[PDB]
């Protein structure tokens, strides 16, 4: 019944959680496992209003919608026993623990899969479970730095800027969901799971575009796009910025519609653009070519809004888009037509929360947001009962601090 037959344990924090969310979105039984200290993602913003409490992190609410929540202390012998029982009944464990931590607690993959040969265990870490960086801490910025990705977010000698929403983490998590699903598929057929090791530094090296090949093939170090006239360039307009791809390569058929747009709008000096010199990459990246392009085009763009340029540029069959802000996104009429934004009342917050919606559509499966993200230990009791614990054993575990159940 969609993915309902798959049980996924999700022991993740600031790093990790989008991977189990993807399983939850197709209906899997996903259980978010926290320590009694709480998932650290609960303590990072942005925030719902002025609230700063454990349910107020918009990221927490988003990445952990569709999951139940339990709290287990794996530093406690009793907790490790409950965790082992949970794993005996799990198809998939996704976790972002420090390399070596679970092994050091006697919870290696071999232990976790002893009575569950099909178990898949996916580890999401900054650098991997192994190798010379595995002992050492990493964060979104420092993974981005070490992977090569961060360096590309600038030109010349300028310091680079960060991508938003911890893309080191998100890239690893997306590939970890893919690796998890591939190993799960393989386990369906072989009866044997395995370990799936996804490192942020490797996942981000997937996003170097062609920088690694520029070095291997030509001995060239590249940085970011943005200074090739009319080709992946950003331009100021009346109320923000737009992104333009009027030409790539020697593709004059891309450029001619752009010249027609400029002519039709009566842009001053549009004839400067009506010249085959713009078909040459070397001219487009020259200081005079880039400066002249910006001079002509931005005299026009500065007088017009994002929405106007999007409408009119696309009317002329040119690849122009707005540099959308959050208000633009919520107002986007295509996303409105598609029903993308999902709003779900949150009882803990006493308010509606709006979330991104489905990243894909299926002929037979249904994507869904799922339940509001759990409170700390919200489902500890009902999940342990599901694994065969009675009340008294569970009350033992709470009183000894091996698990935490909410009020």
């Amino acid at each position: 019944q969609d993915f309902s037959r798959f049980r996924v344990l999700d022991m993740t924090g600031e790093l990790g959680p989008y991977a189990a969310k993807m399983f939850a979105g197709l209906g899997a039984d996903v259980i978010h496992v926290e320590s009694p200290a709480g998932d650290p993602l609960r303590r990072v913003g942005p925030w719902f209003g002025d609230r700063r409490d454990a349910q107020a992190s918009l990221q927490y609410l988003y990445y952990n919608a569709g999951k139940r929540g339990i709290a287990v202390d794996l530093e406690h012998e009793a907790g490790r026993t409950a965790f082992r029982r949970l794993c005996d009944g799990a198809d998939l464990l996704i976790e972002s623990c420090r390399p070596g931590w679970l092994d050091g607690l006697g919870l290696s993959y071999e232990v976790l899969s002893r009575d569950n040969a099909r178990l898949v265990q996916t580890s999401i870490t900054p650098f991997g479970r192994t190798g010379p960086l595995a002992p050492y801490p990493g964060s979104d910025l420092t993974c981005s730095a070490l992977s090569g990705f961060l360096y590309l977010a600038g030109v010349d000698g300028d310091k680079p800027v960060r991508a938003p929403d911890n893309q080191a983490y998100r890239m690893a998590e997306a590939y970890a969901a893919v690796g998890s699903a591939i190993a799960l598929f393989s386990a369906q057929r072989s009866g044997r799971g395995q370990v799936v090791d996804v490192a942020c530094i490797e996942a981000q090296a997937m996003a170097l575009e062609n920088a690694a090949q520029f070095w291997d093939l030509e001995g060239k170090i590249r940085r970011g796009r943005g200074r090739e006239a009319g080709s992946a360039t950003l331009h100021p307009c009346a109320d923000g910025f737009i992104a333009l791809v009027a030409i790539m390569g020697r593709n004059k058929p891309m450029w001619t519609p752009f010249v027609r747009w400029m002519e039709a709008e009566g842009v001053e000096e549009w004839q400067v653009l009506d010249d085959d010199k713009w078909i040459d990459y070397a001219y487009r990246t020259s200081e005079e070519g880039y400066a002249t392009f910006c001079r002509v085009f931005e005299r026009y763009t500065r007088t017009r809004s994002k929405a106007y340029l999007y409408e009119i540029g696309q009317r002329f069959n040119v690849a122009v888009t707005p540099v959308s802000d959050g208000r633009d996104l919520l107002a986007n009429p295509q996303l409105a037509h598609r029903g993308f934004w999902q709003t779900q009342f949150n009882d803990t917050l006493g308010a509606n929360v709006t979330y991104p919606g489905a990243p894909y559509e299926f002929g037979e499966m249904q994507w869904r947001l799922g339940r509001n993200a759990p409170r700390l230990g919200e489902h500890t009791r009902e999940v342990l009962a599901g694994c065969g614990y009675s009340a008294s054993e569970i009350d033992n575990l709470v009183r000894e601090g091996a698990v935490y159940a909410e009020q």
């Binding site: 918009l58 990221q59 010379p132 070490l146 992977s147 370990v195 996804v198 992946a232 709006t354």
Partner: protein
């Protein structure tokens, strides 16, 4: 010598020919799937003519690392699909394929009588994958864009920049590289998992814009919740302090350092030699380090500028402080860690010799990814596939390719 591959026996009919499609099928090919690219010699993949080229020599169609890095391990048959006899060949292939994926203009496969309706009858086990910029119906459904356009449209670019400055984005066509291919792959695997139960394939459809927003939730969620646009923050962070990019010795040399709690701040102070300035009350708490971030960054950079970044990175990591040099592509290629992990792979090619590729960012403990063959030339496997897999007679093959239905 028994090698286990997670997607053994899976066959992919791959019409995709630029953008995210080929990146997704590259991963399938590393898992043991037989990915057969359909590529017409009249309509070659445009990346074949894109730099970088071996030694900067862009002759022919088999020298581009832009093309090559996305196409290892694939087979390639040259079919002219607007020739009538070519359809019958594709039909035989679809009859043997688990996955059909394409990028043709909306309605083209339907014009060839190769839409889902017809594919489901050719092979009810086939999974039929398509994608669009932002959906195939709705007010913006005919709009055009590339990865850089989607970075802008999805909200990423506006939040990738220094405060008060023009935004930058990632410097790349980022949405193409990880966001879209990982969601495509997860959808494919979900359909494959469901098919183990139902025995039926189904359609998988992706809006690239919606896949991108799904990994960049903060911009729209913060505006929806709070009615205020969430601005970009350069290379800072909302919680960590200090958190930034700092000069070290050498050309365009920077180190990323990110401190998340008082213990890591004490460690950074220790590595700095415990200078009295860092003992000021103005830096004693995360909250004060955030408040005084500008001064803090100036003082940190005055010290890092006197240091070798590799030595400083190592000392900080060994003190438990997240740190990483801001690496260029050469440094990533030469990294001890990525090389010990086996991320980089060199493959021999009949025209360009041994050149650099990489596996996808997944280390499977039992069914590891494989890197076997360099990117194919157009039609490299035409005769092999037609004769060995699709059952055409030697005579029929030479008839199909003498009449130049296939090359």
């Amino acid at each position: 010598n028994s090698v286990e591959r997670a997607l053994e026996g899976i066959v992919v009919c791959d019409f995709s020919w630029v953008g995210a499609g080929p990146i997704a099928t590259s991963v399938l090919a590393q898992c043991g799937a037989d990915v057969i690219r359909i590529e017409s010699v009249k309509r070659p993949d445009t990346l074949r003519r894109g730099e970088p080229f071996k030694d900067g020599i862009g002759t022919g169609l088999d020298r581009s690392g832009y093309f090559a890095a996305r196409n290892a391990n694939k087979r390639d048959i040259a079919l002219d699909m607007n020739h009538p006899s070519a359809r019958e060949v594709a039909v035989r292939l679809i009859a043997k394929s688990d996955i059909v994926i394409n990028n043709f203009r909306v309605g083209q496969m339907e014009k060839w009588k190769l839409g889902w309706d017809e594919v489901q009858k050719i092979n009810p086990r086939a999974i039929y994958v398509t994608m669009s910029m932002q959906g195939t119906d709705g007010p913006h459904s005919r709009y055009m864009g590339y990865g850089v356009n989607l970075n802008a449209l999805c909200g990423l670019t506006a939040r990738a920049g220094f405060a008060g400055a023009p935004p930058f984005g990632t410097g790349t066509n980022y949405t193409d590289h990880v966001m879209v291919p990982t969601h495509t792959l997860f959808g494919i695997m979900a359909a494959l998992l469901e098919r183990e139960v139902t025995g039926r394939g189904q359609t998988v459809s992706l809006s690239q814009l919606e896949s991108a927003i799904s990994m960049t939730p903060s911009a729209p969620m913060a505006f929806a919740a709070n009615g205020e646009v969430l601005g970009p923050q350069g290379y800072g962070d909302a919680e960590a302090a200090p958190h930034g990019v700092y000069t070290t010795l050498g050309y365009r040399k920077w180190i990323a350092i990110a401190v998340f709690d008082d213990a890591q701040w004490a460690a950074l102070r220790r590595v700095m030699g415990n200078p009295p300035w860092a003992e000021d009350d103005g830096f004693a708490s995360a909250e004060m380090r955030r408040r005084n971030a500008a001064e803090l960054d100036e003082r940190i950079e005055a010290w890092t500028a006197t240091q070798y970044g590799d030595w400083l990175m190592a000392e900080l990591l060994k003190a438990g402080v997240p740190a990483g040099e801001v690496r260029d592509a050469r440094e990533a290629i030469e990294d001890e860690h990525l090389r010990r992990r086996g991320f980089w792979a060199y493959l021999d090619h009949p025209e360009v010799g041994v050149t650099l590729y990489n596996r996808a960012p997944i280390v499977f403990s039992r069914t590891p990814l494989e890197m076997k063959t360099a990117a194919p030339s157009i039609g490299q496997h035409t005769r092999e596939v037609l004769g060995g897999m699709l059952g055409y007679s030697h005579d029929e093959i030479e008839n199909l390719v003498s009449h130049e239905v296939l090359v």
